[PDB]
C-alpha cells in the first residue's frame, strides 16, 4: 500500500494512496511429513543448536597471560547486530571489544 504525501502540506499529510496485490517470492512448502522438495530430491532442514542471544560472563581459568590470572570477560550477543565484549586486562583494566 503506497501513499502520496502532499509535500507542501506539513508534517503529517496525504494527497493520495494506492495499493495492489503484488506477487513476490517463491517459498517452498512442507509436505505432510516434513520433507521439503527442492528439485525432486526431498531435503530436510535440521535444527541448529546455537548459543542464545544475551549476556555471558566467561573467564580463562588460569589459562592465558602466563600469570595464573583469570580474565573475566563478558559478551552482549544480540540476535542481530554487533557483538559487545568487555574484558579484564591482566593489569586490572576494562576493555571494550566490538566484534
Amino acid at each position: 500500500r503506497l501513499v502520496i504525501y502532499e509535500r507542501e502540506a506539513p508534517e503529517g499529510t496525504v494527497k493520495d494512496i494506492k495499493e495492489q496485490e503484488v506477487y513476490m517470492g517463491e517459498i517452498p512448502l512442507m509436505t505432510d511429513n516434513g520433507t521439503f522438495v527442492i528439485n525432486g530430491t526431498e531435503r530436510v532442514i535440521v535444527s541448529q543448536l546455537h548459543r542464545s542471544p544475551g549476556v555471558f560472563f566467561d573467564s580463562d581459568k588460569g589459562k592465558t597471560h602466563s600469570s595464573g590470572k583469570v580474565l573475566y570477560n563478558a559478551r552482549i550477543i544480540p540476535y542481530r547486530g554487533s557483538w559487545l565484549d568487555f574484558e579484564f586486562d591482566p593489569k586490572d583494566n576494562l576493555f571494550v571489544r566490538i566484534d
Binding site: 502540506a9 506539513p10 508534517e11 503529517g12 496525504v14 494527497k15 494512496i17 494506492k18 495492489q20 496485490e21
Partner: protein
C-alpha cells in the same frame, strides 16, 4: 440514477477510467480518513480522499459493454490528455471565433404578441398534449430572451413536433426574421411544405422551398427572393449549405432531425449568422450530441403523453419468412392500411419488387429508391401518399421521416446493416393513429445475421413501451459511443475524455483569449484555497451506511459557500439522522473555515499540534498593523514566514483547543479586517 453505480465506469483525470469499487476509511498517520476504491487493470486499487472528490466524474463515453481500464502508470491517459489539449488549443479556429464573438458580440430579442398568437392558437385544429405545451413554453420564452437561442425538441414521433416549430415560426414572422428551416431530405421537405401551406393558409406569410424539386431556375428565383428577404419561411435540404443562401436578415434557424446532418454541416449553417436563434429538432440525437444534450451546454426537452391513440408497435424479430410476409401483408390490407417493404439495394430493388409482386398477388406494389429520376420518385410518393398502392418495395429512403398515418405494417427483409436509432425511426413509420401498427423485421439466419444486429434486435424487441425514445437513446449512447467533441466521427469512442473536460479546456481557452493569460496559463489544477488542521473528519460508515448519501453530503460540503448552507445541512442531518458526530461537526466547521478564507483572502493554511503557517493573498483584508502588534506582543507564539506567510507556535494539544484557536482566530481577523 446519474452517479455512483457500483462497477460503473468512472473517470479520474490523472490516471484514466476505472470502475467504482466502494468507499472505506484508512489510517494513514493518525488520520483514519475516508477514501474511495477505484479498480484499474491488473486490479490496481486507488483510494481517493473525500476532499479530492472533484477529480472523479461519470464516464461520458458510455461504452458500458467495454471501457478502457487504464492500468496504473500506463500513461495512455496522459497521452490522450495531451492530445486533447492539443485539440483544445485556443488557436482552434473552429469555435474560438464563436467564443471571440461571444466575448465581443450579442444577439436578438424576440418580442411576444399576446393577442395575434391566440389567433394562430385557434388555427391549431387539435388539443396540445401537456408534455408538448410546456415544450412550446420553453421554446417561445427562450425566443423572447436576447441571447442566441439554442434548443432541442427531441420528442417522440408524430407528437406534433411540427406544431412547436410552426408556433416558433409564427413568433419569428411576427418579427419577420426570415425563418430558415432545414431537414436532410427533399421528401419530408415537400411534406413539411404542404404542412406549412395548409396550416398558414391565412396570414401574409411567404413560405417557399429551395430544393431539387425546384429547378435550376425556379430555385434560383426562390434564392433571389431570399436575398431580397421577401420569403418569410424557407424550407430546404443541404442546398442551404452551398454558401449561396444569404438572408438579408436571418434570425431563426430550425434544424430538424440533426442525426443525419453531420456537425460540419451544423456549423456550416451556424457560421453564417451569428445572432441567429438556432432551433434543433429530432426524435433521436447522435450519442455525441446526446451527451452534449444531457450535459446542458444547450437545451433539452423530451415529449411524452401521446396525442390521441399512439401505441406500442409490435416488434417482430423474425427470420426471413415468406409466410410471415403473407400474413403481415394480408392482415395489414384487411386492416385497410399500407405496407412498407425495406430492401436497401438499388441494384436488386427492381428484381425484389418483380418477385414480390407475384409473390403477393393481392398487393399493389411500386419501387422506391434514391437512384432514379426525382420526378419519377415524386410520382411514386404521389401514389403512396394518396393510397394508390399498398406494399412499397423500397430502400431505406423511407427512413426520411415520411408521415403517412395510414401505413401500419413495415417489413424489413434484411435487418443486418442498420443502426438502432434508424430501426426506431423505421418503427416510427407505422402507427401515428388509432389503428394498430406491426413492425416485421425479417432476418437472415442468426449465425449469418451479424455481429451487432443481434444486440440491436434484442434492444429493439425488449424496448417497446411509452417513453422509449430516450431509453433507446441511452442505449444508442454506449452501443456506438460519443465521438470527438468538436471534430468529425461522432460514432466511436474517439478518446472520450468527457464533456466536463470541455468546460475546463474552454475556460482555459477563455484565459488564453483574455490576452494577458496564455494557453500556457492552463489552470488544470485549481484547489484555489486549502486548509488543514489534522483531525480525522469523516462521515462515519456506521453513522452513514449509504455511500451514495455520504458522497452526496460530501458534495454538499464542497458546494457549501455560506454558513446558512452549513446550518441547513446540519439541521437536515439531525432531522433525518439524529446524532451529531465529532468528525462530522468538525468538517462542517472546516468548510466554514474555507468559507471564511474565501471571504477573507487566505490562499493556504497549515495547522498541527504546535501551530502552523498562514499564506495570505494580495487582494486581502489582513490587518498589517494589528498583525505586527500581534507579533510584538507574542513573539513567543509567532514568527514571520516570508512576507506572505506566518508561522504560529501554539500549544495545540487538545483538538477542541485547536478548534477554538482557529475559530476565534479568524474572528479576530474578521474584526479588524482591512
Amino acid at each position: 440514477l446519474a452517479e455512483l453505480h457500483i462497477g460503473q465506469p468512472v473517470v479520474h483525470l490523472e490516471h484514466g477510467v476505472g470502475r467504482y469499487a466502494g468507499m472505506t476509511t484508512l489510517e494513514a498517520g493518525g488520520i483514519t480518513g475516508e477514501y474511495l476504491m477505484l479498480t484499474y487493470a491488473n486490479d490496481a486499487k486507488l483510494y481517493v480522499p473525500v476532499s479530492s472528490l472533484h477529480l472523479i466524474s461519470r464516464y461520458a463515453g458510455g461504452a458500458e459493454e467495454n471501457a478502457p481500464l487504464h492500468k496504473l502508470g500506463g500513461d495512455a491517459w496522459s497521452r490522450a490528455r495531451q492530445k486533447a489539449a492539443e485539440k483544445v488549443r485556443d488557436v482552434a479556429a473552429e469555435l474560438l471565433d464563436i467564443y471571440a464573438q461571444r466575448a465581443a458580440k450579442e444577439g436578438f430579442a424576440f418580442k411576444h404578441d399576446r393577442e395575434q398568437y391566440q389567433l394562430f392558437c385557434d388555427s391549431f385544429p387539435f388539443e396540445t398534449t401537456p408534455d408538448q405545451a410546456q415544450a412550446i413554453n420553453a421554446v417561445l420564452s427562450d425566443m423572447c430572451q436576447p441571447l442566441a437561442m439554442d434548443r432541442l425538441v427531441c420528442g417522440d414521433v408524430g407528437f406534433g413536433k411540427t406544431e412547436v416549430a410552426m408556433r416558433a415560426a409564427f413568433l419569428a414572422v411576427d418579427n419577420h426574421k426570415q425563418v430558415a428551416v432545414l431537414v436532410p431530405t427533399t421528401l419530408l421537405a415537400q411534406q413539411h411544405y404542404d404542412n406549412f401551406r395548409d396550416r398558414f393558409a391565412n396570414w401574409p406569410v411567404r413560405i417557399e422551398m429551395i430544393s431539387r424539386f425546384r429547378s435550376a431556375k425556379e430555385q434560383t428565383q426562390i434564392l433571389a427572393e431570399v436575398a431580397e428577404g421577401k420569403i418569410d419561411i424557407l424550407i430546404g435540404t443541404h442546398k442551404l449549405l452551398q454558401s449561396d443562401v444569404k438572408f438579408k436578415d436571418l434570425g431563426l434557424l430550425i434544424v430538424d432531425e440533426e442525426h443525419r446532418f453531420g456537425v460540419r454541416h451544423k456549423e456550416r449553417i451556424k457560421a453564417m449568422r451569428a445572432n441567429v436563434d438556432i432551433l434543433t429538432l429530432t426524435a433521436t440525437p447522435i450519442p455525441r450530441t446526446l451527451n452534449m444534450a444531457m450535459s446542458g451546454m444547450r437545451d433539452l426537452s423530451i415529449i411524452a403523453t401521446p396525442p390521441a391513440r399512439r401505441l406500442a408497435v409490435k416488434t417482430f424479430v423474425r427470420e426471413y419468412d415468406s409466410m410471415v410476409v403473407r400474413e403481415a401483408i394480408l392482415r395489414e390490407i384487411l386492416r385497410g392500411g399500407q405496407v412498407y417493404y425495406l430492401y436497401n439495394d438499388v441494384e436488386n430493388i427492381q428484381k425484389a419488387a418483380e418477385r414480390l409482386a407475384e409473390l403477393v398477388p393481392e398487393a399493389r406494389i411500386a419501387i422506391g429508391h434514391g437512384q432514379m429520376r426525382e420526378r419519377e420518385l415524386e410520382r411514386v410518393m404521389n401514389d403512396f401518399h394518396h393510397q394508390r398502392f399498398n406494399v412499397l418495395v423500397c430502400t431505406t429512403i423511407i427512413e426520411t421521416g415520411i408521415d403517412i398515418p395510414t401505413a401500419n405494417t413495415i417489413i424489413i427483409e434484411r435487418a443486418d446493416h442498420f443502426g438502432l436509432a434508424q430501426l426506431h425511426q423505421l418503427r416510427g413509420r407505422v402507427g401515428r393513429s388509432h389503428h394498430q401498427a406491426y413492425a416485421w423485421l425479417l432476418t437472415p439466419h442468426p449465425k449469418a445475421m451479424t455481429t451487432d444486429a443481434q444486440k440491436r434486435l434484442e434492444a429493439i424487441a425488449s424496448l417497446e413501451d411509452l417513453g422509449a425514445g430516450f431509453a433507446l437513446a441511452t442505449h444508442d449512447l454506449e452501443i456506438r459511443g460519443a465521438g470527438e467533441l468538436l471534430g468529425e466521427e461522432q460514432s466511436g469512442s474517439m478518446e472520450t475524455i468527457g464533456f466536463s473536460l470541455y468546460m475546463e479546456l474552454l475556460e482555459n481557452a477563455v484565459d488564453a483569449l483574455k490576452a494577458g493569460r496564455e494557453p500556457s496559463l492552463e489552470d488544470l489544477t485549481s484547489q484555489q484555497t486549502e486548509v488543514e488542521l489534522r483531525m480525522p473528519s469523516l462521515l462515519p460508515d456506521d453513522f452513514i451506511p449509504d455511500v451514495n448519501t455520504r458522497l452526496s453530503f460530501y458534495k454538499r460540503i464542497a458546494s457549501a459557500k455560506t454558513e446558512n448552507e452549513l446550518e441547513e445541512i446540519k439541521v437536515e442531518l439531525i432531522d433525518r439522522f439524529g446524532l451529531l458526530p465529532d468528525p462530522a461537526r468538525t468538517l462542517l466547521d472546516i468548510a466554514r473555515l474555507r468559507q471564511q478564507a474565501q471571504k477573507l483572502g487566505i490562499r493556504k493554511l497549515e495547522g498541527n499540534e504546535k501551530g502552523g503557517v498562514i499564506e495570505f493573498a494580495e487582494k486581502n483584508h489582513v490587518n498589517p498593523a494589528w498583525l505586527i502588534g500581534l507579533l510584538q506582543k507574542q513573539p513567543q507564539h509567532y514568527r514571520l514566514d516570508g512576507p506572505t506567510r506566518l508561522k504560529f507556535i501554539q500549544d495545540l494539544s487538545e483538538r477542541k483547543t485547536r478548534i477554538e484557536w482557529v475559530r476565534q482566530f479568524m474572528r479576530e481577523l474578521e474584526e479588524n479586517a482591512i
